[PDB]
Design a protein around this nucleic acid. Structure first.
Length: 599
RNA sequence: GUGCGCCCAGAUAGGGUGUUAAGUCAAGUAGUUUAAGGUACUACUCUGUAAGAUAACACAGAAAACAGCCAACCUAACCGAAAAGCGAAAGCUGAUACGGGAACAGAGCACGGUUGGAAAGCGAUGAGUUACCUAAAGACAAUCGGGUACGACUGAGUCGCAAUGUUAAUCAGAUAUAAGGUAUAAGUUGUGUUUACUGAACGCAAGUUUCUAAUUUCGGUUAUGUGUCGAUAGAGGAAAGUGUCUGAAACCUCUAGUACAAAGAAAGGUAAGUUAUGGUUGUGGACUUAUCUGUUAUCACCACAUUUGUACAAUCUGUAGGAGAACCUAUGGGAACGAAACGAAAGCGAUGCCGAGAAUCUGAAUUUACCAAGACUUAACACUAACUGGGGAUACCCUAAACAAGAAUGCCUAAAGGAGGAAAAAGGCUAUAGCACUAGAGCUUGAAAAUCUUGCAAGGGUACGGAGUACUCGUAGUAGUCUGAGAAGGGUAACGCCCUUUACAUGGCAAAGGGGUACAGUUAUUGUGUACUAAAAUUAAAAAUUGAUUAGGGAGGAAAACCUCAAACCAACAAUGGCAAUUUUAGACAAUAACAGAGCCGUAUACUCCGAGAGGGGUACGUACGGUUCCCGAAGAGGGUGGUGCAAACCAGUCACAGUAAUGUGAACAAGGCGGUACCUCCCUACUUCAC
RNA sequence: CACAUCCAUAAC
């Protein structure tokens, strides 16, 4: 009959085909409970699952009967999502709080389902220039887009919108949805989420090392709003550009044409008077790469957007670059009701560093003349060349985590992190290899990535001074205790296969600025394509520590996040070390007596 | 829970410190002197100066001692125990029998001792094999072509430092709070490091040790030898510097790693100051000073990077700033234009203390003018220790001493006879099957020697490691004037002080370790307080109603334009109306439970290291007594009166089955009993390693 | 463009 998940894929082709359909009758799909399994095939890969909203309902309970206790309450307009619990936290290096949000498990499975319906309709309407909270797009696709078609632009518009994600209008958002979805009971389910919700966002930009992925925490809602801007300026791109004929300058064509008249003469004679005209060939060559092959009267705008930033590269004047900053204020006022901050829409001319996603971003004008071998272009003119901010960002990291020390000649000398003596030699290197591999993998596109050598010096020699103090040893005895047999140093464990070693991270295996690893590798699980999942053990109705296959006892989910905190002396922790999984079933009689023996 | 470490007393059981006073000891050789002075002179002998080559005359030296270093041997204190006694074991005791044997700290408290002159460590090293790169880009062949101190792997064979220290000989004075040093607690949290608390016992003062910098290659290069594209050097390489055939007139190494001039100019080596430190206080490298006998003859020369200025180019040289780059000033390239790390901090002051040569000058100073102070040996005096002699109230282990206390065992012949007729278990007894018991099993046999349950005189062991303020016991004796005053003064200083007076045998700390009680402080529990004063930002203030608002209902299976379906209503800011622990205004406390050492300062006293000294670092906070905040230990192990289930199994009749009772019994996780394990606990314990 | 050493050893 197409079980619901082929009907949703039937729509995600349907938006692409009709270039404007008013998509009606979307509510009837949330109720057949087959899509409420892909919601449970999503909610296992999110970090923040222990913090709760106001009621004490723990983040589990995945049972087909509360599917009815869901889906029947989705019927008579009697599901109303939770009010606010403001357990405050503030952004790095600043005194600002941006409100933080969480539901009860119920809401997470409707929300994670109204995400999938709304992701079916809007995803082939999201324009290419957005790269924020999407599939198959991340931080690095934005950077890579800058490294191609931003190349060679005279000026920047390095925008900011004054709290763009707490200023989100709860009333003209829903007016925009209801151009597309012409459905009545959908919006009221959405508008239970707006004003009975929160505004529910974070600050920790360094969690993915320069990303607001925690540091904005929402579904796609924020993108649906902004897509009216990403529709506007890619409409502004056609009013702006007027493409002129002249690309190679007329100062350049008088020198470009006279090369071929005398290069045709160089082969007609070699000898002594060849060398005399070779001086008016080779010393005349000294203003040939000083002559440039580009013209700055043609007019070209670009646009890139992540979630809340956007950067706009324009081929023109500063007259022009203060007209684009004009016809944005006429917009984010009138059609989105927000202030594009005149303080911090920094126009910075391009040859100066911008700042977009934690990179410094700029065009090269340093007129060096390399070889490309027998052929020769200027490979460094007009190339957008991304850069770490070593002075803002890595300087901050090195001192925020207490690696280093400024010395009296300003030289940073590394010492031990005081609070890490309390773990093993394997725990500390896994502390430190994790931190180093994050920044380097973040900053792998950086044209001065080689410069992170100072940072990886400091990390490596401060990992060893921690392990030094715990053993009561020195920095030299600790490479001599942890010797190999090839001059490198490692950390041993006895595990089942014989001895291995933990080494330290690197460059060529954190650098690669074309390929990378696509889910941030914080002990990643496999794709369980052998039916080990959280859906076909539900149908087994099984009892592992239970023995009685009873219907009046509720089956559910016992998914806690972490497994390293389980000790193995109590009755419940001996099952999770055997099957090696975050989760199992939980009973109606099993949870309340065996887990809750003390409390 | 750091080897010792209590409290009073004594001073060789082993020792330490100080004081005088005798005796002896050794200064290259002689001389003079006194004297058995010692370095002063005189004369010779040997050595030292390569500070960047050798010789000739002047400056420094020449012993013995103790104190230390290093190495190899032999042996006190310590070990599972020999061994050995001991209600037999609970625990105690090891002249020497092996094991270490300088031990782990000498820092309060011995390892010693002979013999020799030298090891860790740290920089400059072969072997012993790399694995690699090889001046030709590569292909060709250890072509020792021709490196192997390229670093490996190797674990120590060569050179340097480590490898010394102390001991009187011109006297007094002069810029004596002189420069210049040193103390002036510790900690908590103010994190904008803004002038803040605590018996801080100092005062002022918010921005300071600190970097952003080198010009006739001092680039896009670390916080290093290096290694690579430019301007800029192409003649070897395109008949191998050993060879072969090449790529190209392209290919490597330096010079073009400076346009003048000044000087020093490699190595060792002296003494200062650094970095080395790190987390506080003392031994190797490497920077930086300065210093290494004057004069003659061969000897006396080519550097080279900076010390020095420019000298011009120069990148693109902070930058505040207006400025598509090869665009515009200006203190010009520390020149606040900016940046990063760092609290009653950096600095400056104020007080009491230290202040060598005897600064350099001034009078030195008179038979070289004066010197008695090293080390041992003996005596006398003074002191002194955590050493030595004395001195001992709670919890744990033990249980012999029938020491005090409850356990004595069968029936039938027929109670008469007794079981002394018979049997024979039972308390018993040996091994150890075995799963505790049954002791098997002949057996004293028919309560003793083994039922538990306690204990003095008992026998052991541990606690003498500071947290808050009041009481038991050995004693106010073990101390005759308490080092905490007796007792009063006496300021001080925070005190207890030490200073002045003064009491006479209860006059004195109230000798020791550990208990006990009353109220405190923190943590983990457990229950509740919740008007001692009620009303509020207003959290319970989407309620209701609302506002006369608003477009919008309810239970299910199709793609989107739309298949179907059974056939007068929730929601749209809030507003408005009582309270709860309290920020808005006040005459969260109960209840139980347990309990640790970071120091620091004052006087006394014991030690050591760095310093000329003042002082600083440590020794359990060194210890004691006075003061003070900070602060409120972890983990395993056994043990359990007290906890419980399960496979086996205990035993006659709790069970059959008869029997002279016991006896063969097939059947008790029907455990009548209860171990054997598993579990959660709950409790005790420096038992064991940690932590200071 | 740049791979990375020496950071000593020893008073509680």
């Amino acid at each position: 009959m197409k079980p619901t998940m082929a009907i949703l894929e039937r729509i995600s082709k349907n938006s692409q085909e009709n270039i404007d359909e008013v998509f009606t009758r979307l509510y009837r799909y949330l109720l057949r409970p087959d899509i409420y399994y892909v919601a449970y095939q999503n909610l296992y890969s999110n970090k923040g699952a222990s913090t709760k909203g106001i009621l004490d309902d723990t983040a589990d309970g995945f049972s087909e009967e509360k599917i009815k206790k869901i889906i029947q309450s989705l019927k008579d307009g009697t599901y109303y999502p939770q009010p606010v619990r403001r357990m405050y936290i503030a952004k790095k290096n600043s005194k600002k709080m941006r409100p933080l949000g969480i539901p009860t498990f119920t809401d997470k499975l409707i929300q994670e389902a109204v995400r999938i319906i709304l992701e079916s309709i809007y995803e082939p309407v999201f324009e290419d220039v957005s790269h924020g909270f999407r599939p198959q797009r991340s931080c690095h696709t934005a950077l890579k887009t800058i490294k191609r078609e931003f190349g060679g632009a005279r000026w920047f518009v390095e925008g900011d919108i004054k709290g763009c994600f707490d200023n989100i209008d709860h009333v003209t958002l829903i007016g925009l949805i209801n151009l597309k979805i012409k459905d009545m009971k959908m919006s009221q389910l959405i508008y239970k989420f707006l004003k009975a919700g929160y505004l529910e966002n974070w600050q920790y930009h360094k969690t993915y090392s320069g990303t607001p992925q925690g540091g904005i925490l929402s579904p796609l809602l924020a993108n649906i709003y902004l897509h009216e801007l990403d529709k506007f300026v890619l409409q502004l791109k056609m009013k702006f550009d007027r493409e002129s004929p002249e690309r190679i300058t007329p100062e350049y064509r008088e020198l470009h044409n006279e090369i071929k008249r005398i290069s045709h003469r160089l082969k007609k004679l070699e000898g002594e008077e060849k060398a005399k005209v070779l001086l008016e060939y080779q010393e005349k060559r000294k203003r040939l790469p000083t002559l440039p092959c580009t013209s700055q009267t043609n007019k070209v705008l670009k646009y890139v957007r992540y979630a809340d930033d956007f950067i706009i590269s324009v081929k023109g004047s500063k007259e022009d670059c203060q007209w684009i900053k004009e016809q944005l204020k006429l917009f984010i006022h009138n059609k989105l009701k927000m202030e594009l901050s005149e303080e911090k829409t920094l126009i910075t001319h391009s040859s100066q560093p911008a700042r977009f996603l934690g990179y410094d971003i700029r065009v090269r004008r340093s007129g060096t003349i390399k070889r490309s071998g027998k052929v020769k272009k200027r490979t460094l003119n007009g190339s957008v060349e991304l850069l770490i901010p070593l002075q803002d960002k890595i300087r901050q990291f090195i001192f925020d985590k207490k690696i280093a020390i400024q010395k009296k000649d300003s030289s940073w000398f590394p010492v031990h992190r005081k609070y890490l003596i309390r773990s093993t030699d394997l725990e500390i290197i896994t502390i430190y290899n994790s931190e180093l591999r994050g920044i380097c993998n973040y900053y792998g596109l950086a044209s001065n990535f080689n410069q992170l050598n100072y940072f990886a010096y400091l990390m490596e020699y401060s990992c060893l001074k921690t392990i030094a103090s715990k053993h009561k040893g020195t920095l030299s005895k600790t490479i001599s205790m942890f010797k190999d047999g090839s001059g490198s140093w490692g950390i041993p464990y006895e595990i089942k296969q014989g001895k291995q070693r933990r080494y330290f991270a690197n460059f060529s295996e954190c650098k690669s600025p074309y390929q990378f690893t696509d889910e941030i590798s914080q002990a990643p699980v496999l794709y369980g394509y052998a039916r080990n999942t959280l859906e076909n053990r539900l149908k087994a109705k099984c009892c592992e520590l239970c023995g009685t296959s009873d219907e009046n006892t509720s089956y559910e989910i016992h998914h806690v996040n972490k497994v390293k905190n389980l000790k193995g002396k109590e009755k419940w922790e001996m099952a999770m070390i055997a099957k090696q999984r975050k989760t199992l079933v939980v009973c109606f009689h099993c949870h309340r007596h065996v887990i809750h023996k003390h409390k």
